[PDB]
Structures are given as structure tokens and as C-alpha cells.
Amino acid sequence: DIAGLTPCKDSKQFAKREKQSIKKLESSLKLYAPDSAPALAINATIEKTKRRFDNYGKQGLLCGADGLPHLIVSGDQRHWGEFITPGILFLYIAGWIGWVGRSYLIAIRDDKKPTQKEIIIDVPLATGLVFRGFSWPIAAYRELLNGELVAKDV
Amino acid sequence: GFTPPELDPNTPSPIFGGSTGGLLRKAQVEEFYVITWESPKEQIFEMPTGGAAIMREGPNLLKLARKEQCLALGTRLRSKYKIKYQFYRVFPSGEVQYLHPKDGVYPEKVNPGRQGVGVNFRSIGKNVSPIEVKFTGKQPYDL
Amino acid sequence: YQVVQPINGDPFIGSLETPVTSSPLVAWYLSNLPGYRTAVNPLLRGIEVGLAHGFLLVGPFVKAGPLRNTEIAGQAGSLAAGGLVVILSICLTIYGISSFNEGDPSTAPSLTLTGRKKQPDQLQTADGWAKFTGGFFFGGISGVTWAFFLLYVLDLPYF
Amino acid sequence: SHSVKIYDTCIGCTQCVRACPTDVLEMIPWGGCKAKQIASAPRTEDCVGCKRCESACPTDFLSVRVYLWHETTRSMGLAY
Amino acid sequence: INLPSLFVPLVGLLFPAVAMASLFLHVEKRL
Amino acid sequence: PEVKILVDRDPIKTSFEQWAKPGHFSRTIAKGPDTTTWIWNLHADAHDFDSHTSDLEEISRKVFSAHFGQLSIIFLWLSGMYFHGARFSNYEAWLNDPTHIRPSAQVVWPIVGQEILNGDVGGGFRGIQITSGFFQIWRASGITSELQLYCTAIGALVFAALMLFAGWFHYHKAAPKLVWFQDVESMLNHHLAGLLGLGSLSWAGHQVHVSLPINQFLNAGVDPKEIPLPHEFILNRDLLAQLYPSFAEGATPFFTLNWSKYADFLTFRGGLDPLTGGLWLTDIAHHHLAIAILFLIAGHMYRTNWGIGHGIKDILEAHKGPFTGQGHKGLYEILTTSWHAQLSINLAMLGSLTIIVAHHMYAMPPYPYLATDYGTQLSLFTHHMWIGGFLIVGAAAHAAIFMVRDYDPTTRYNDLLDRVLRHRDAIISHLNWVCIFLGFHSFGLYIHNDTMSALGRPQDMFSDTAIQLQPVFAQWIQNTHALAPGTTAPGATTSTSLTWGGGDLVSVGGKVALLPIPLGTADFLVHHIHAFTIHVTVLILLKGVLFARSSRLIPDKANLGFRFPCDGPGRGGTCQVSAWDHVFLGLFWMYNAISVVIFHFSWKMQSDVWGSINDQGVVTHITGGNFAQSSITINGWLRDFLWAQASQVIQSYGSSLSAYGLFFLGAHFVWAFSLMFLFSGRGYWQELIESIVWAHNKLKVAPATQPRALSIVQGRAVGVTHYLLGGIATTWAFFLARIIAVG
Amino acid sequence: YGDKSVYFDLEDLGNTTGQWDLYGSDAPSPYNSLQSKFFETFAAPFTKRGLLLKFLILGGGSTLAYFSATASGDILPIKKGPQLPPQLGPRLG
């Protein structure tokens, strides 16, 4: 496949690592009582590990000679779920945060003592402002086009 | 124009028990400083070098190894005890040099008998760059 | 009664008078050492100092040296002591050359503890220091030779 | 000896003179401000380079500038 | 006759000694 | 003259007005923030009461209330301990089989795969092993069930609430007046007798009734749940009579002065209990009884209200000789008007006391099953050592603060202090010489050994087999201690500790509890290293304190204050001339000294003390006695100690100790991060922040509160804080992982 | 200087600045003439700055060269040389 890697579902070292992990987890389980709280916790962890490995095989991740999943970020459409749509999600959230904070700073910049509203957050105004980050992708775009995103005269 | 007071030996020195912060060989071969004041009453003050000393009644004379020490002592005498002081620089040859207050009035108060030294008639931002004074003995600020 | 006093009663000189600094026996002992025999020819004081130091240096080199266990311990240690004396002579000569000039008087103090005049110690001159260092070198070599001869060359049970 | 310069922006506030710990600066008659005063540096040979004067100057940029230069036993503040 | 035996002390003891003495004399005295 | 209770009503009314205003104490701070620097200042001077005001009464009231708050915090911490032991611990399982189960009183919820930290500690329990040694304390106290731990936790919570209320009430409702705080005679009398003596008597009373009978039943092999409850032993007295017959007479021996009859449970045996590996509880009870008597007597010294007693002023002023003029005259007035003087004295004493506590606690273990719990021993020793070192450094910090701020010869003149300030130059010069001499001969010998070993000349090394440097004095002293019982101290059967000698190795559960510690050439070298480091740090701190007010460089250093960056680049440069900077350097040197001390302790214990006993009595030590021959070179310390023993921590990944490896790496990171602050200056950072702020201004997103770079002193403080945190934490992780995996 | 409490006078600056010799003897030679007459006569040729310096440097250099170039086997193991066969490297040698 890409970069000489093979799918984890049909890879062999991936399955070997899965088996070894479960064996290691089970080794501890046999020491305690069959149905004690530690035994239940260890069983839950084993089930979690099995579910994790099955999901990794299901999503179609690529596994190297090491038997571990590898992430392709070149832009291949078969792997957009590895970096590109999480990347878009991060960009949206981070722009939300930055736009909300900038809106707060611009809103409080007109008082005689703006610093007072900076060490003591004016929550009433902040609660109204935080929701602009839902549509910041549009507000920032029209802010740039309208030419007042960037401070002229500087 | 303010004849500076002449240093008067025989004036008593402050009561002091001795210290390891006194004069050294520099006083012997280079220079040392002497400060004099009046102090209306006998009282205990903090020495600029060691512990505490007591000013005698009437004139007091103290010899220090640094001018900065003399100035610190004078500042304490002027602000804490409200005493007028003057100090000199003494060379191994036997010379004495009146130092402060140079013209009878302390340097803080403007006096009509002082000329300007090292005053530039321009803002600090109008000095030439080093390239213009390169390979000449002058510095850009000396101009 | 207080024991510690300012120097000569002058409380503005950076020092004190203490039993260690100025006690009768200590003052006498210090004044009777070659370094402080001001009115004596510097060569003889140097001879005494060199003898003492050269004899001193032999012990540590011989006993603690790399060849202490070997039969040639005495020879090796004595040679090392002689070499150290030679290096000390070099140091003395360069110090004197750098710190003194022929045409200048002695830099030693001219006053004593009572304020009376006295001839400044000639050791602090150029030729005075040259004589002192030559005497020190001679005395050091002689002391090393004597310490080496006293042991090994002669049995003389010690330790 | 360090070089101390007074520039014409000085407002004669006197704060630098109060600060000098070796009596290097002074106040002299002048006519270009309300105080008719300006700082002078006639005794820079006693300057130690502490730059305590510059910390007191309220003008922007400074009106008193200390340029550290050749070092002497007086400038190095040595008592021995 | 072993050439290294002669030179190693010469360059490690004699040379630094003479050089340091000469340079101390040069640096440390008024001209 | 008389001692009485003086207070003032409603000095400050509880309210929320000052909460809304950040930094009410300082007027400029109260005005508001101009730059980010403001914020830092607000924290840097939070507890600097003597700077916010000048009235001694207000400072004293604030100090008293803050003491109440901190006491409340400590009580809350203890309540948390007892609750966690009660609910989230395997205390009963450990109680049934001490040597078998590894103590643990913390579990982690399973959220992000961190449940791996819930390791197998034994007793049908999975959690994080604890090295605080609480299980041993609870066993020694007689706690057998979790109901008692629950009750103790609830009581400690209630006392934390009471402490908090007391602080509020004393600062806001009834604030003692200054004369009340200045009454030191009655204070000393009560603390010596009311607190220490009476508290020790109370604890001895508990031990006689609860610790002794309960621990006797436990050591007899009775299951913990079958033991009579601690209160039964008080109701029916034959319960006690069975274990110790002398309880039959009951108190009459105490009142007829037939005290010998109490020899059953009040002994002078010494040594260790061969079953539990700790001190005999019958010795500890007698200990606390004697201590109670001594303190109750000593707390009757100073005069308060009935003429009889001692005036501290009289005692002080009665001492003076020809070498010190009128010494001790005026010290009473100094120590009753300045809090920093008292704080420095007390900090020095408490640091020394904590260090001594560490030494004595690993010397003769006082709790059952503590000696063979190697992790607990190592952790306790290291913890107490670090606490003591920090307190000692704080002593110097506050001595310098007093010297700068409260020292005044015009009104409060003392002769001894004046003489010290007058010959400080000689003091510091001789201390400097001693430091150099010790450094050359202690460390130089290590370098000599290393060079000889590298050149293939082991016969020239300073070792036990080449050139021996035997500590004859220490050997003689510990030999005199070994012969002590029966010769010079007839009433004792066993020596004070098993480290002195006499053989009689003590082991528990197949593990060595204690045995004689030999002193050789390596011990000599490391002890001289210790002396060197202590002397250098003392030099730094003492020079900071003595030259705090003035020196030949800056004759008016006091006018600048205790804390300040410098005095400019004049006089060649006056960087770090303040006393605060001397404390800042003393911190580094204290870290060096304590690190070397704990390394010595750990390696020596592993090499020559800790280990496993076998059937024939052959002791196999954790490290096969390589300290004597490998510790005499730096290469051995790097190889046989650091490299060899780091394997446990670095491998911890994939197991319950993985957290220790994570903290190892993180501590390395934080330590290296500190160098960022320790090596740079604030000018570069301010210049860079200028460009950053411009980039922000370009987008109308610049903060109103201007972001300034950290102050110089703050840069130093941050650097030292991060350095200490990183180093101490990496050593913490290393020690814990090594001793839990190998112990 | 020293009248009562005065500690300063321009007439005698040496005393004022503490230019004393704490331990100078100012006493005659403790040696009898005969011993000095020998020492000053046999140690005379070593009291010249340049001569002594040059002689010391070159004599010490020649002594070191001679003693190091003619050392015996029991002195320095470096020049006694190896006495064992040489081992091989992991693959080189």
C-alpha cells in the first residue's frame, strides 16, 4: 500500500501485538478471585483492549513492520480521517477561541480603565460574545473583505 | 567666590572601637578621603564601613578610603541628623583638595556661578552613526 | 577590661589588635624571623629561609612520591625537592625583576609602631631582593642535600 | 573615566542630581525651560558608572546618558 | 637517544616555563 | 508587669469589599494594573505583612491568624490521610500479614488507560504503593479496624474547621493586643509545659493503655479482628494484668515510690525488637514518661505573675566577658520587637532538628515493620533531609531580611552584633580559606583516585587496599558505643542502635532490618565531602547576612533594600550584590549538599546494610558491598550508582511504576527548562516581546495591560525554583522506582 | 598626631595612613661575622638577576633533559615498554 505499509486488518504483527497485550492483561487476572472488584476491573480493561484493536482494524489504518498504526497526512482521500478533517475541526475550534477573545478585547477597549475588565472578567459581556464563534468563519471573512480586520495606519 | 574651608587637624574623631573595613594600602600610596561635620550633640550613628560609632560634641573628622563612602555618610548626616558636612581628598604628598559642596551650596540647588560641562544642545536621537566617526579618534557622543 | 583594641589606638585603619595579632610572645617570635630582620643583610636571611624550606620539602616528596616503595625512594624524592627549589628560585627571580627597579628606593614602610624614623628594609629593593633570592636558592639546594644525606646516605633510625 | 552627557531635552527636574552616589552632576543656570535649570557633569572623573542617574530621569528618551569608557581605580570603586 | 624522551619534557616543562616567565615579565612591568 | 489576657473587639469587620479589589494592601496596587508586572508583584508581597504597614500590633495579629489558617490546612491534610487509609487502602490485609503485603492507600479511576498504575500490591488489592509510612504509625498506635480510621478522619476534619474558625475569630472578632504577643516568659512556660511536656505525658498515657496491650496481642499472633477493643483494656483491668502482671497493684507502686515494680512495661532494654524490627514499645512509653517529667519541670523557669521564676532580660544581661564587652545586653529588646529575628532563629533550629530526626530515624527504627520496609526508610530519610535543608536556608534568608530592615543601632543597640559586623571581613576571609582547603582535599582526593585508576596505578590510589584514610575517631566512638551497655551504661542490655556494633544482626521476614555499619576510607572521603559542601553553603549564607547593609563595594547597600537586582554596571559590575541573591545562590549549594548526602545514604544502605538473610545466616546485600571499593572514584559513582540503579526507573514503562519513569523524564525536562531563566537576561526578552506586541497591534488584538518581561529578581527566582523542582523530582522518581522495584 | 583623639595631620601622612611595620626587628645581625663571612663569599655568584635567571633556566632544562633521556627501566614504565603479547580488536587488529 502507501509507503510500503499494509492494512492493519490483514497485518500479522498487529495481530501478534494484540494477542500479546491480551495475554499480558490476562496474566494478572488469574491471581485474584474470579468475581472480585480487581478481577472485574481487569476484565473491563481486557474488553476495552479487544474493542480498541477491533476498531483500529475496522477503520482501515495502515500498519508498518513494527505492527503499529501509521498516519498518512499527504492528503490521500483514503486517509482524510487521520489528519485533515480533525485538522479542519481544530482550525474551527481555535478560530472560535481566538475570535471570541479578540471580540472581548475590542469590546472592552473603549472604557476609561480597560485593564479593570481584564483582570476581573466581565462575565455578562463574555457570555454574549462567546456565541459569535459559531459563525466566526463568516465574520472574519467579511471582516477581512471589509478591510477592518487589520489595523490600518500601522 | 566661596573660599573653601581649610582642613583643620587636631579636630576630634568619632568614638569607634576599630574595624576591619577601614583604610588599606591604597590610602598609603594613592589617596584617601576625609569628611568633617559639626553634630550639635553626642549621638550614635551607623558607620559606612562597619558597626556603630558615636559623634563627639563639636567638630568631628572621619577619614574614609572611598569618595562614595564619604557621600553616603554625608547623605545620612544630612537627612537623618540634619547636619552640614564637607569632605576632602588627601594625597600621599600632603595635598588636600576641597571636594564637596564644591561652591558652598550643594549641587542640588542651582547656583549662578557654575559653567556647563559635557552638555549637548540636541536630543539624544540626533547623534551621528559610528560609520561617520570611523577611523577618527572621536566617539559619536563626544561630538 | 577588653582584650581586642584598634590598631595602635587608631580605629579607622582596617585592622585590629588581638592576642593572636599582637601578643608579647607572638610579636617577639614574628620579629625574630628572617623575613622581618630588617637591619640584616638580605643574603643571610635568604640563606636561612632557603635552608629551612629545602630541608622541609624533602620529606613529602620522598615518602608520598610515586617511587616511595622502590629502593630509589630517597634519590627520587630528593631530586624532586631540588627541582621544586629550582622552580621556586625561578619564581623569586621573576618576581623581583618584575616588581623592583635598580634606581628606586625600598618600598618598605619607613615608620615603626611608635612613630619614629627607621631605615626602610633593603629587602624590598632590586639588588636587595636579588641577594635574598640568590641566598634562598643556595640555602634551598643545601637544605635538600642535607636532608637527603641525613637519611638514606646515613641510616639514623627515625620514625 | 566614564563619559556622562546631558542633552537639551532636560527639564531641570533635579532628580538625577539627588541620585548620583559620587557627586558628579550639578544644576546650572539655563533659559530654555520653566525651571531655568539644566544638568551638568563637571566631575565625571569620579563617576563609578552605576547609571543610577539615568534611572531617575523622567524624559523619554533620557536627557542624561552615561557611556562607560576607560576604567580607573576611582571608576572601579576599589578601596584597596 | 629515544627522541620522544628528550622532547616531551622539553615541550611540556621547559618550553611552558620559559614562555610563561618571559610573557609574565613582558606583560607585568612599566615600559 | 503582670501576665493577663488582652484583646481588642472587632478590629476588622468580615466583608467582601476587599475581595473585589485586587491588592488592597498596597495603595498603588489598589489603584489598578498598568502592566503585567503588577500581577507578579501582587503575589510576591502577599505575606510580607511588615511592608504593607509599620504597626507591630497589626503584623502580630496577621501572623497569629495566618498561623491558625496553616494549622487548619495541616489538620485537613491529616484528615485526608486518615480517610484514604480508612476507605481506599488495604490496611487490614497488611495488618494480617505485614511483611507479605505492600502498603497502599491510593487507587486511580480507570479513564485514559491509567488504571495500569493500580498495581498488584497484595492483599486482594490494586492501588498505588505508599511510602509515607502511615501503616506503621497506625499499627504502633493500636489501630486495628477501619472504623477507628474513619473516626480519626472525621475528628481531624472537625478540628480543621475549628482551626479555621479560630483564625477568623481572632483576626476579626477578638484580636490580641501587642503586650499579649510580647509576653514571652509565659509563652515559653506554657509551650515547654502545657504543650510539649503535657502532650508527651498524654501520649505516654495512650501508649501504656492502647499501644502496649494491642501490639502485644498482635505480636502474639492473634488475628487483628479477634483482639479486644482498645477501650476494653481500660474497663476490665485483668486484661492488662494478664500481659503485664504489675498492673495488678494499680498505682500504689507509683505513690509508695515502689517504681521498680513497674519494670514490666517500663524498661530500659535498648536495641530492636527481634519480632517486629522496631524499638521496644515498653522503652518508648518510658521515654515519653521521662520526657513529660523533664518538660513539665523545665516549663517552670520564667517568671510570669508570682515572683518566682527567671526574667529573660536578667539572664541575658548577666552574661558578658572581657572578649565581648557588654554582650547580651539589648538582645531581649531585639527579639521581642522583630518577627524576622525570631523566624530566623526558629527556622535554623527546626531545620537542624529535622535533619537530626532523619538521622535518628534510620539509625534505630521506632515503628514496627519499618526497618524492613526499605522504600519507607529511604523516602522518610530523604524527605526529612530536604525539609531540614530548606528550613536552614530560610533561616539565613530571614536573618538577612532582619539585618536590612529591623536592625537599628540608634534605638536597639547590641554589642555582640556590632563586633561581628566590625570583623566580618576576617570572618568571611577565614571561612573562604576553610572552604578552599576542604574543597581541594575532599574532592581532590577523588580526582586523584580517578586519575590513578585511569593510568593503571591502583597501588597509588586512596583506597582501603592502597593508601588507607581510616576514620580512626569515628571508629573509636562507635566502638565505645558498642561496649557501652553493661560497662558505662549498666542499666541497658543492648546498645542504643545496632549500627554501633556488637554483632546481633536483626532481621524480619527474611529481610535484614539492621546490622553493624562499617566505616572505612570511602566513608572518610564522603564525610569530608559533606563537610566541604556544608561549609561552602554556610559561607554563601553568612556572607549574604553579614554584608547585607554595606560593603567596600556599595557603602549604602541597605538603602537599596533586601531585594533588588543590582546597582548598575558601575565599579566593574554590581550584579547580585543583595542578600536575596545570596540566598538564591545558597539554594543551589544546599541542593548540591543534600543531593550528595542522600546519594551517600542510599548507596551505603544498599551496599552494606539492606539485603536478604538466608537459612545459614548468609546476608546477600542488594548491592554486593561494592560501595567500599567503587565509591572512591567519580567513575564508580557514575557507573555503579547512577547507571546501574537507573535501570529500574528507565524500564518502568509498561508496568505500575511507569508513572515514576514519566516523572523522571519530566523532572529532567523542567530542570533543563530552568536553565532558560538562569542563563539569560530580561532585556532580550523585553525586546522580543516588543515584536510580539507589534504583531498583536497589527490585528487590533493587543492587550490593554501591557505585557512586560519578568523582572530581574523574578527571573532569578523562577530559575532557582525550576532548577530545584526538576532536580529534586528526578531524584525522587529515581529513588522511589529503584527501591520499590528492588526492595 | 596622637595628641588626644586626633588621628590626622598633614605633617606626618605616613603615620596617619598606618604605614608602619608591625614586626620589623631593627636589631643587629644575630649571626657572628665568621659564618656570614663564609655565606656571603660562597653564595656570592648567585646574586645577579639576569645571570641567576638564565643559569637557573638553562641548568634546570639540561638537568631535566639528561635525567629523562637516561632513565632506567625501574623508573618509568612508559619507556620500559610492553611485556605482553597484544590482543586483537573485535574484528580489526
Ligand code: CLA
Ligand atoms: C606536561 C609535561 C609533564 C611532564 C614531562 C611530567 C613528568 C613527570 N611528572 Mg608531572 N604533571 C604535569 C605535567 C608533566 N609531568 C601537570 C600539568 C601536572 C598537573 C596535573 C602534573 C602533576 C604531577 C604530579 C602530582 C606528579 C607528577 C610526577 C611526574 C614524574 C613522574 C614519573 C617519575 O617518577 O619520574 C621520576 C621521579 C622523580 C622524583 C625525579 C624528578 C624529576 C626531575 C629529576 C627533577 C629535576 C627538575 C629540574 C631541576 C628542572 C626543574 C624544572 C625546569 C624545567 C623549569 C615525571 C618526571 C610525579 C612525581 O614524580 O613527583 C615529582 C608526581 O607526583 N606530575
Ligand code: CLA
Ligand atoms: C602543528 C603540528 C604538530 C603537532 C600538533 C605535533 C604534536 C606532537 N609532536 Mg611534533 N613535530 C612537528 C609538528 C607537530 N607536532 C614537526 C613539523 C616536526 C618536525 C618534522 C615535529 C617533530 C617532533 C618530534 C621529534 C617529536 C614530536 C613529538 C610530538 C608530540 C609530543 C609533544 C612534543 O614533543 O612537542 C613537539 C616537538 C617538536 C620538536 C616540534 C617542533 C616542530 C614545530 C615546527 C614546532 C612548532 C612551534 C610553533 C611556534 C607553534 C606552531 C603553531 C601552533 C600549533 C602553536 C605531540 C603529540 C614528540 C613525540 O614523538 O611524541 C611522543 C617528539 O619527540 N614532534
Ligand code: CLA
Ligand atoms: C470566612 C469568611 C471571611 C471573610 C469574608 C474574610 C474577609 C476578609 N479578610 Mg479574612 N480570614 C478568615 C475568613 C474570612 N475573611 C479566616 C477563616 C481567617 C483565618 C485564616 C482569616 C484571616 C485573615 C487575615 C490575617 C487577614 C484577613 C483579611 C481579610 C480582608 C481582606 C481580603 C481577604 O480576605 O483576603 C483574600 C481572600 C482570599 C480567599 C485569599 C486566599 C487565602 C486562603 C487561606 C488560601 C488557601 C491556601 C491554599 C490551601 C494554598 C495551596 C494552594 C493550592 C490550592 C494550589 C477581607 C475583608 C486581611 C485584612 O483584613 O487586611 C487588613 C488580613 O490580613 N483575614
Ligand code: CLA
Ligand atoms: C588535594 C588532592 C590531592 C592530594 C592530597 C594528592 C596527594 C598525592 N598525590 Mg596527587 N593529584 C591530584 C590531587 C591530589 N593529590 C590531582 C587533582 C591530580 C591531577 C589529576 C593529581 C595527580 C597526581 C599524580 C600524577 C601523582 C600524584 C601523586 C600524589 C602523592 C605524592 C604527591 C607529592 O609528593 O607531591 C608533593 C607534596 C608536597 C610538596 C607536600 C606539600 C603539602 C604539605 C605536606 C602541607 C603543608 C601544610 C602544613 C601542615 C601547614 C603547617 C604550617 C606550620 C608548619 C607553620 C600524594 C599522596 C604521585 C603519586 O605517586 O601518588 C602516590 C603522582 O605521581 N597526584
Ligand code: CLA
Ligand atoms: C496549654 C497551653 C498552650 C498550648 C497547649 C498551646 C499550643 C499551641 N500554641 Mg500557644 N500560647 C499559649 C498557650 C498554649 N499554646 C499562651 C498562654 C500564649 C500567650 C503567651 C500562647 C501564644 C501563642 C502564639 C502567639 C502562638 C501559639 C501557637 C500554638 C500552636 C503551635 C503550633 C503547634 O505546635 O501546633 C500543635 C497542634 C496541636 C497540639 C493540635 C491541638 C490544638 C489544640 C486544640 C490547642 C488548644 C490550646 C489552646 C491554648 C486552648 C485555649 C483556647 C480555649 C479558649 C478553647 C500550638 C497548638 C502558634 C499558633 O498560632 O499555632 C499555629 C502561635 O502563633 N501560642
Ligand code: CLA
Ligand atoms: C515558617 C517558614 C517561613 C515563613 C513563615 C516565611 C515567611 C515569609 N517569607 Mg520566607 N523562606 C522560608 C521560610 C519561611 N518564610 C524558607 C525555608 C526559605 C528558603 C527557601 C525562605 C526564603 C525566602 C525568601 C528569598 C523570601 C522570603 C520572603 C518571606 C516573606 C514574604 C513571602 C511571600 O509571601 O512572598 C510570596 C510567596 C510566594 C509567591 C509563594 C512561592 C511559591 C513557590 C515558589 C512554589 C512552590 C512549588 C511547590 C512546592 C511544588 C510545585 C507545585 C506547582 C507545580 C503547582 C514572609 C514574611 C520574602 C521577603 O521579602 O521577606 C520579607 C523573600 O524575599 N522567604
Ligand SMILES: CC1=C(/C=C/C(C)=C/C=CC(/C)=C/C=C/C=C(C)\C=C\C=C(C)\C=C\C2=C(C)CCCC2(C)C)C(C)(C)CCC1
Ligand atoms: C493543505 C495541506 C497541507 C499543506 C498546506 C500548505 C503548505 C499551505 C498553506 C498556507 C498558507 C500560506 C497560509 C497562510 C496564511 C497567511 C496569512 C497572512 C494569514 C492570516 C490569518 C490571520 C491574521 C487570522 C487572525 C485571526 C483569526 C481569523 C483567528 C482568531 C482571531 C485572529 C484575529 C487571531 C499539507 C500537505 C501539509 C497536509 C494536508 C493539508
Ligand code: SF4
Ligand atoms: S552613572 Fe552613577 S556615578 Fe556616574 S554620573 Fe550617573 S549616577 Fe553619578
Ligand code: SF4
Ligand atoms: S533627571 Fe533628567 S530631566 Fe531631570 S534634571 Fe536630570 S537630566 Fe534633567
Ligand code: SF4
Ligand atoms: S546585567 Fe543586569 S544585574 Fe548586571 S548590572 Fe546590568 S542590569 Fe544590573
